[PDB]
Structure 1
Amino acid sequence: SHGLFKKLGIPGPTPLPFLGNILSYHKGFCMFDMECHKKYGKVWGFYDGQQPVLAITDPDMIKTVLVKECYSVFTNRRPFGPVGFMKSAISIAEDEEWKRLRSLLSPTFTSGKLKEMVPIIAQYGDVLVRNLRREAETGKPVTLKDVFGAYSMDVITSTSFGVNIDSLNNPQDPFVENTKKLLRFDFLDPFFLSITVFPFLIPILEVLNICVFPREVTNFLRKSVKRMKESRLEDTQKHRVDFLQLMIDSQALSDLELVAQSIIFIFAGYETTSSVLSFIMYELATHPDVQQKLQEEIDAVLPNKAPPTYDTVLQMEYLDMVVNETLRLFPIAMRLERVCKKDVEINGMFIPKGVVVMIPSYALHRDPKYWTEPEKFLPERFSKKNKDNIDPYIYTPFGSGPRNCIGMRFALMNMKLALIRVLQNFSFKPCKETQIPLKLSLGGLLQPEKPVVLKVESRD
C-alpha cells in the first residue's frame, strides 16, 4: 500500500512499515500539515497506518471535491473506530443514508427555526453574565473554558430538550453529568493511534459492543429521550421549539436515528462552542483596541445594555469580523476529509479509489500566499473593503458543499449572542497567569497548551 504515491508521482513523507507516517504527528495535526505544505507544495500524500491520504490545496480542486463531485465520488468521511448505533448519526452516516438524514434535518436548521430559538439562547446569556459578575466582584482570574463550557451546556440542554439548568451551579445534576462527558475525540490518543495501526481490530470491538461513545452516557440520553418523549407530551398544548420537537414533528426519521442525532448535536456543539468562545475572548483581551471597537458597535446597536435579538445580531459587522478572524486562526476541525469512492481524474489529477482526500484548513488559513501576516489577528481582513479577496475554498472553518457544517448558522448565532451579553457588561484583560503569546497543544485537538485565564472587570 505504501508504494501508492510513489507510483503516482506524488510527493510526501516516506512511510515506515506498519506505522505509515503517524510518528510525524508528535507535534499534532496542524504542524504536520504546515510542514508538509511548505516542503511538498500544492499536493502531497501520506499514510495513516496503511491508509493513503492525499492532501490538496488548489481552490479549484477543493471545490470539485467538496462541491462538484460530492454526491458521485466524495460523499463520505473516513470511518474512525467502533461506533455502534451511532453509525446513523448524520456526521457518520454514508451515501444514501446520509443523503436522507441531511434532508430530514435540513428544515430543522433554517434561519426561521433559528430565530425561534434565539429567546431560549438569550436567556442563558443572562445566566452567564450573572455567574460571571459573581467573579467580576471577586477579582480572581477566570478560566474561560469553564464559564463558557457551562454556557455552552446550558444552551445545548435547553435548545436540544427544553431542559433548563444553570449547569455552572448545578454541577452534579445527572443530565449535566452525562452530557459533560461528550467531549471531542483525540485521534492522537493511544486508543485511536492503535486503531489506526490495527484497523483490522475495529470489527472485533463492534461485535463486543465496545463503542467510542460512552455507553453509560448514550444509555442515559436514550432513556431520557424515550421518557421525555415517552408520554410527557401526552397533552400537546405547549408548543415547543427545541431540536427534539422539530425532529419529533419530522416523524421519516427512525426513533433510533432521532436519538443518534440528539446525541451528535450535543457532541458537535458542546466543546466546539466553548473552545471558540475562549479563543475569541483571548484575542479580545490581548487586543484592547479591538475589544473596545466591538463594545462600541454593540452599544450603538443595543444602547443601554438592550437585549440582543436575531436581527440586531445580524446587524453587527465588526462582531462578525472578529468571529471570522478568530476562526481563521483557530479552525477547530483542522482538516476536512472525503473518501474517494471510485477511480477519478479531477482538475488534471488521477485519484485512486479508496484514497482519503484531505483539505488542510488550518494550513490553508495561515498560508502566506492568501493571507498577509497570517499569524496576526486582524479583523479588518473580513471588512467589506477586504473580504472579496477571500477564497471560500481557502477559508473553510465550517467546510463547504452539501456536507458542510449543518449547525453553522446556529453556532455563529449562539456565540454572537454570548459575546454580546458578556461584552455589554464586562471587559476582559490579561492576567499575570495569562499565557502570552498563546501556545497550541501538541495533542490531536486544536486547543491552548494551558487553559485561557483572564481578569474580568465589570463595566461600572
Structure 2
Amino acid sequence: THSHGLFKKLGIPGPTPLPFLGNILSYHKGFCMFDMECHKKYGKVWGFYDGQQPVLAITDPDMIKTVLVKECYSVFTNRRPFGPVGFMKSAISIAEDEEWKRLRSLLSPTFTSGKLKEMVPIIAQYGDVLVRNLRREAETGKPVTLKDVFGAYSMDVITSTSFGVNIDSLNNPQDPFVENTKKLLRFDFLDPFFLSITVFPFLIPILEVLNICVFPREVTNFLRKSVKRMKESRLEDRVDFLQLMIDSQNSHKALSDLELVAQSIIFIFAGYETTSSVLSFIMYELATHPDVQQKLQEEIDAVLPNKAPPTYDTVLQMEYLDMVVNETLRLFPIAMRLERVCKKDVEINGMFIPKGVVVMIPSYALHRDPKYWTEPEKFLPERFSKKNKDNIDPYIYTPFGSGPRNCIGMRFALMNMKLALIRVLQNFSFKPCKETQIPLKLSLGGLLQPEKPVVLKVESRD
C-alpha cells in the first residue's frame, strides 16, 4: 500500500509487510527481540515498516558514523515524530533543524564539566539521604525494591539540580512537587495509544488541534507556573539548571520563557526513570556477581578511606566503577535504538537512501552481537578495562548515541549514577533474595525494563 514496495525495489531484505500494519505485529516480542532476529535473519542491513513508515536498519560502523556524525547537519538532523506534543515542540530533543541547532547551542554550556563539578556537592547530599533511607530498610530485614529507593533518589537529585527544591521524596511521596514529577514516565511505544499513532499517524494532527498531548496537560501546567514562581522569586533575591537557563537568556534570539520551561521538563523526563532504571540494572549485576561487587567495594575504600565522601575528581579516578557502569549499559542500553530522519535523497557508504526514510541503529542488538563481543550475554566488566577498552568500536557501543545529537546529559547522568553507587556500596552489600528474579527477564514491552521489578537483600557493612 502507497509505499510498501520501497525496500523490495532497492534490493534490501526484510520481513514482508501486511497492509496498513506493515510489520508492527512483529513487535509482539519487543523491539529488542525483533531487532536481534532481524540482524540474525537478514545480515548487515534490513528494512521494515512501522505502518506505512519505512525504516532502514544499519549495522556497519562506517555507515553509522556518516549518519550520526558526518552528515548529521546536512542530512540526518532530526528524530521521528511520535505523537502530539503541544508546546513541548520546543524541547531540544523534540525540536528540529535550526531551532534544534539554536537550542543545542543555547543549552550546551549548562552541561560542561565545569558546571557539573559545581553540581556534585548538591548531588552528594542526597546520597546521604539515600543511605539513611536504605539503612532504615536494612535494619528491618525486609527485601528492598530498588526502583523505589533509587527512584526516590533520582527524584531528589532532579528536584535539586534543576530547581533548588529539596525534598526527601521517599518520605514525602505526597508533596505537590513530587507528585507531578512522578508522572513524567517513559513512553511505552508499544502501548495501545502509540501503536495506533503508528497505524493512524494522520491522527496526530487531529489530537494537536484538540490540545491533547502525550505530556499530561496537568503536569506541564503545574511546572509552568512552579517555574514562573521560582523565576520571579530568585529574580530578584547559583547553581541549578533553571538558574543556568535564566542566566543564558540574559542560535542567538535568547531563550524564550516557554522555551525555557520546556527544556526544564525534558530534563526531568530524561533524568528520572533512566537514572532509576540504570541504577537498578547495576545493583542487579553487582548482587548476582558478588566478586564484581567485592572488587568494586575494595576499589572504593582505596580511593575513599574511612568512607570518605566522593568528590568529582575521586569519582573520575575509579576505573573498575567506570567499567562496571559501562558494561551494564552494554547489556541494557535503555534507548535500545537510535533513529534519524533522512531529509534528502542521499547515497552513503555505497547505498542509496530515498528522502523520508527513518534510519535506525539497533543499539541493543549491536550490544549483544557475537561478531563484536565474545560471550555477549555474560556480564564481564573487564571488556572495558583500560587494556581492552581500545578494541571497542564507538559506533557499535553507543549507550548515549554519538555525534552532534548524542545525549547532552551524558556526563551528568554518569556522574549522578556513580555518586550513588559509591555512597551505597561504601555502606551496604547487596544479595539475592528468593523473590529475586534470577535470571532477570526483560520486558516484552516497548521499554527496556525488567519483567518483574528487581528485589534484593541489603545488609549493612556494620
Which deviations, in whole Å up to 9, do the C-alpha atoms of 1:335-378 show, x marking residues without a partner? 00000000000000000000000000000000000000000000
Q: CA RMSD in A?
A: 0.5
For residue 301 of structure 1, what is the aligned residue in structure 2? 303
Aligned-partner Cα distance in 1 for 2:205–2:450: 35
Aligned-partner Cα distance in 1 for 2:203–2:191: 16
Q: Note the C-alpha offset of 1:234.
A: 1.6
Secondary structure of the 1:17 match is coil
For residue 242 of structure 1, what is the aligned residue in structure 2? 240
Aligned-partner Cα distance in 2 for 1:334–1:253: 31
1:167-182 → structure 2 map (5 Å cutoff): 167-182=169-184
Which deviations, in whole Å up to 9, do the C-alpha atoms of 1:387-435 show, x marking residues without a partner? 1100000000000000000000000000000000000000000000000
For residue 29 of structure 1, what is the aligned residue in structure 2? 31
For residue 263 of structure 2, what is the aligned residue in structure 1? 261
Aligned-partner Cα distance in 2 for 1:326–1:230: 42
Aligned-partner Cα distance in 2 for 1:273–1:7: 43
1:333-412 → structure 2 map (5 Å cutoff): 333-412=335-414
Q: Note the C-alpha offset of 1:230.
A: 2.2
Aligned-partner Cα distance in 2 for 1:391–1:448: 27
Secondary structure of the 1:397 match is coil
Aligned-partner Cα distance in 1 for 2:132–2:180: 25
Q: Which of structure 1's runs of 4+ aligned residues deviate more than 3 A?
A: none
Aligned-partner Cα distance in 2 for 1:171–1:436: 30
TM-score (norm 2): 0.98
Q: Note the C-alpha offset of 1:48.
A: 0.1
Aligned-partner Cα distance in 2 for 1:253–1:294: 43
Aligned-partner Cα distance in 1 for 2:440–2:213: 34
Which deviations, in whole Å up to 9, do the C-alpha atoms of 1:303-355 show, x marking residues without a partner? 01000000000000000000000000000000000000000000000000000
Aligned-partner Cα distance in 2 for 1:12–1:269: 35
The partner residue of 1:203 within 196, 202, 205 is: 205
Q: Note the C-alpha offset of 1:199.
A: 0.4
Aligned-partner Cα distance in 2 for 1:232–1:148: 30
The partner residue of 1:123 within 116, 122, 125 is: 125
Q: Note the C-alpha offset of 1:46.
A: 0.2
The partner residue of 1:318 within 305, 315, 320 is: 320
Aligned-partner Cα distance in 1 for 2:234–2:326: 41
Aligned-partner Cα distance in 2 for 1:241–1:369: 46
Secondary structure of the 2:446 match is coil
Q: Note the C-alpha offset of 1:233.
A: 3.2
Aligned-partner Cα distance in 2 for 1:325–1:286: 14
Aligned-partner Cα distance in 1 for 2:15–2:154: 40
Aligned-partner Cα distance in 2 for 1:264–1:253: 15
Aligned-partner Cα distance in 2 for 1:448–1:272: 13
For residue 229 of structure 1, what is the aligned residue in structure 2? 231
Q: Note the C-alpha offset of 1:232.
A: 4.0
Which deviations, in whole Å up to 9, do the C-alpha atoms of 1:4-28 show, x marking residues without a partner? 0000000000000000000000010
Secondary structure of the 1:234 match is coil
Q: Note the C-alpha offset of 1:223.
A: 0.4
Aligned-partner Cα distance in 2 for 1:162–1:232: 11
Aligned-partner Cα distance in 1 for 2:376–2:190: 26
Sequence identity, in percent? Answer: 100
Aligned-partner Cα distance in 1 for 2:329–2:149: 20
Q: Note the C-alpha offset of 1:384.
A: 1.0
Q: Report how many residues are paired.
A: 456
TM-score (norm 1): 0.99
Which deviations, in whole Å up to 9, do the C-alpha atoms of 1:87-115 show, x marking residues without a partner? 01000000000000000100000000000
Which deviations, in whole Å up to 9, do the C-alpha atoms of 1:225-262 show, x marking residues without a partner? 00111234322xxxx11000000000111111100000
Aligned-partner Cα distance in 2 for 1:223–1:373: 51
Secondary structure of the 1:345 match is strand
